[PDB]
Design a protein. Structure first.
Length: 118
């Protein structure tokens, strides 16, 4: 289960996929909400979830994995990457990165990179 793959799937299919995972009344929800729910769900079942994008490092030192669809401009599905990850892995703006991710925790709004390229 990849965030980019879910993002490129038809809403109707995401709905069937989601309800087959115990989710309810997705038929009347926004595709973006359905994806996040499907991903948080799959995660709660003990499975790994993935994501990817082209890294953009911000002035302050943290970054986000941007997506071509959003035209590489800040989007709700951006993947957060810590200054520590950038530092330890010698990452740079422009790098194509893929990896396991986790839904946001209390206080966060975006999915976070769990392990880089792993």
């Amino acid at each position: 289960m990849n965030l980019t793959e879910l993002k490129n799937t038809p809403v109707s299919e995401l709905i069937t996929l989601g309800e087959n995972m115990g989710l309810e009344n997705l038929a009347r929800m926004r595709k973006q909400d359905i994806i996040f729910a499907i991903l948080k769900q799959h995660a709660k079942s003990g499975e790994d979830i993935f994501g990817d994008g082209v890294l953009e490092i911000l002035q302050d030192g943290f970054g986000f994995l941007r997506s071509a669809d959003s035209s590489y401009l800040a989007g709700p599905d951006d993947i957060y990457v810590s200054p520590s990850q950038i530092r330890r892995f010698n990452l740079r703006t422009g790098d194509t990165i893929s990896g396991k991710i986790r839904p946001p925790k209390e206080g966060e709004r975006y999915f976070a990179l769990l392990k880089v390229n792993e």
